[PDB]
Design a protein around this ligand. Structure first.
Ligand SMILES: O=P(O)(O)O[C@@H]1[C@@H](OP(=O)(O)O)[C@H](OP(=O)(O)O)[C@H](O)[C@H](OP(=O)(O)O)[C@H]1OP(=O)(O)O
Ligand SMILES: Nc1ncnc2c1ncn2[C@@H]1O[C@H](COP(=O)(O)OP(=O)(O)OP(=O)(O)O)[C@@H](O)[C@H]1O
Ligand SMILES: [Mg+2]
Ligand SMILES: [Mg+2]
Length: 246
């Protein structure tokens, strides 16, 4: 929402509309478990750029799809609720309904949108709003994730282990419960023209505008973030199992 959402430059320069995302990146900046594990985008720093009468703060981070020729993108929103203690009351009826009619309250993960580039471009776009109808069960979420790995010619079963390995690293850090994250996503991307060796594939946690730093502030409500990651991992392992029958 804060920038035109589509990437073949090196960077994303994301505006700071509140303190939370920038406080989080600054806080994990020296923690090798966040920054050497490859589980969040490479953080270049917070920067001031001219805006209005003065300056606006931005986060400079890596563009995860830099130099991708045929990008495939899947965004999965993580947690058992997508509201937090600061959510506006006028948004709450909708947040409550979407959380309960999607897989969010049951699995702690929900479909958020997908793009597949199968040579016939324009790309095929799958709306985030599919989550309360077409992708509203574990079985249908599994089918759409399989579809992400369908490059238009075959299932890219060889990429799935990378994705599980990434989720393992996320699980290991989030077990420590230093942060609560609401409305954050795991972004899965790959270039369908990649080989394994080219390493044009990525799996990162993103969007930290509603992150709470538990050593600094109270946040009583639960995020269910670790429950969601565990469920998503379990779905990917099911997919590995299912892709052997091919
Ligand atoms: O957070 P998302 O992606 O699910 O979508 C946001 C919408 O939520 P929904 O998907 O309708 O539950 C969200 O709707 P709400 O008004 O927050 O219910 C907005 O449309 C938001 O755009 P912005 O922050 O107003 O610029 C939308 O943000 P962007 O998709 O534009 O980032
Ligand atoms: N580092 C990145 N590289 C490539 N794509 C990204 C990156 N970060 C975000 N995106 C893409 O841009 C979309 C929007 O990003 P994000 O949700 O972080 O910001 P926002 O919607 O502008 O603001 P808010 O933090 O209020 O949601 C993501 O859903 C994802 O598709
Ligand atoms: Mg947004
Ligand atoms: Mg967002």
């Amino acid at each position: 929402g804060s920038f035109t959402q589509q990437p073949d430059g090196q960077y994303l320069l994301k505006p700071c509309l509140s303190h939370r995302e920038r406080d989080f990146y600054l806080h994990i900046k020296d923690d090798k478990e966040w920054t050497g594990t490859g589980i969040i985008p490479k953080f270049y720093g917070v920067e001031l750029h001219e805006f209005g009468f003065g300056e606006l703060e931005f986060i400079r981070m890596e563009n995860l799809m830099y130099k991708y020729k045929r990008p495939f993108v899947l965004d999965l929103k993580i947690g058992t609720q997508t509201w937090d203690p600061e959510t506006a009351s006028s948004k709450m009826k909708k947040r409550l309904v979407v959380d309960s009619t999607s897989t969010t309250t049951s699995l702690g993960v929900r479909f958020s949108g997908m793009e597949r580039n199968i040579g016939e471009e324009k790309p095929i776009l799958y709306s985030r709003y599919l989550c309360t109808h077409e992708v509203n069960t574990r079985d249908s979420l599994k089918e759409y994730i399989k579809l992400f790995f369908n490059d238009g010619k075959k299932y890219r079963k060889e990429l799935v282990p990378y994705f599980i390995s990434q989720l393992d690293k996320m699980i290991e850090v989030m077990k420590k419960r230093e942060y609560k994250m609401f409305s954050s996503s795991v972004l899965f991307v790959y270039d369908s023209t990649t080989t394994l060796e080219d390493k044009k594939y990525n799996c990162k946690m993103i969007d930290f505008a509603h992150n709470w730093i538990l050593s600094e502030e109270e946040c009583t409500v639960e995020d269910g973030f670790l429950f969601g990651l565990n469920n998503l991992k379990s779905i990917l392992e099911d997919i590995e199992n299912e892709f052997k029958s091919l």
